[PDB]
Design a protein around this ligand. Structure first.
Ligand SMILES: O=C(O)c1ccc2c(c1)CCCC2
Length: 214
């Protein structure tokens, strides 16, 4: 399969990314609490549904929510302001709440069953989001030998996500509060602006009724 790209909604962020986030890849966005990582996650869940001429892949999206950050009303607002039908945008985004890190790891196996079901239909899964991927791993693995166990567990989780990305031609997008194909550092700036830098030029964008934009 040819590498597809999903537009982030910001032309500036898209140019930094080579046209958007790639399928058969894991893109990780990291930053401090309140930098806009979840906003980007929400905008991509809408953008993936658009035709390629509009920056999408005619795809559906899976959203693994670890900290209760999924807002369907936000997807609706983003869809309405991008000239999409809000009810239809919601019907193409499936959300699952991860209750702890072990549950989060099992949800990746369940995502594979949903990907298989939709494979070769008119709306195949083209995006899998894991919001605050490390949140549960950081709060649960405190102690002596807990740190080596945290590392073994995340390594296995990340390898399961890499496997899905390549096998089913999906863009995996993960957020992390301070392994990936691409790492993007996100920070707040002056005048409510958000700044993105590739880790290993800078994009500048705003958080608006259109999700994220120039
Ligand atoms: O509703 C469910 O049973 C369910 C289970 C797993 C996953 C989703 C939904 C959506 C995101 C991917 C992981």
């Amino acid at each position: 399969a040819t590498i597809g790209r999903i537009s982030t909604g910001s032309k500036s962020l898209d140019k930094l990314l080579g046209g958007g986030i790639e399928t058969q890849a894991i893109t990780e966005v990291f930053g401090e609490f309140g930098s806009g990582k979840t906003q980007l996650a929400h905008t991509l869940a809408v953008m993936v549904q658009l035709p390629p001429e509009e920056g999408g892949l005619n795809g559906s999206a899976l959203y693994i929510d670890t900290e209760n950050t999924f807002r369907p009303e936000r997807l609706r607002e983003i869809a309405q302001n991008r000239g999409l039908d809000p009810d239809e945008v919601l019907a193409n985004v499936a959300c699952a709440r991860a209750f702890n890190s072990n549950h989060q790891m099992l949800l990746v196996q369940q995502a594979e069953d949903m990907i298989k079901e939709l494979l070769n239909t008119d709306r195949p899964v083209k995006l899998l989001i894991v919001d605050s991927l490390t949140s549960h791993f950081r709060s649960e693995y405190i102690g002596r030998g807990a740190l080596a166990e945290r590392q073994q567990k995340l390594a296995k989780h990340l390898a399961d996500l890499h496997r899905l990305a390549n096998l089913y031609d999906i863009a995996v997008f993960v957020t992390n509060q301070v392994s990936a194909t691409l790492r993007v550092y996100l920070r707040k700036g002056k005048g409510g602006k958000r700044i993105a830098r590739l880790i290993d030029g800078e994009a500048v964008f705003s958080i608006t009724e259109k999700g994220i934009e120039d």
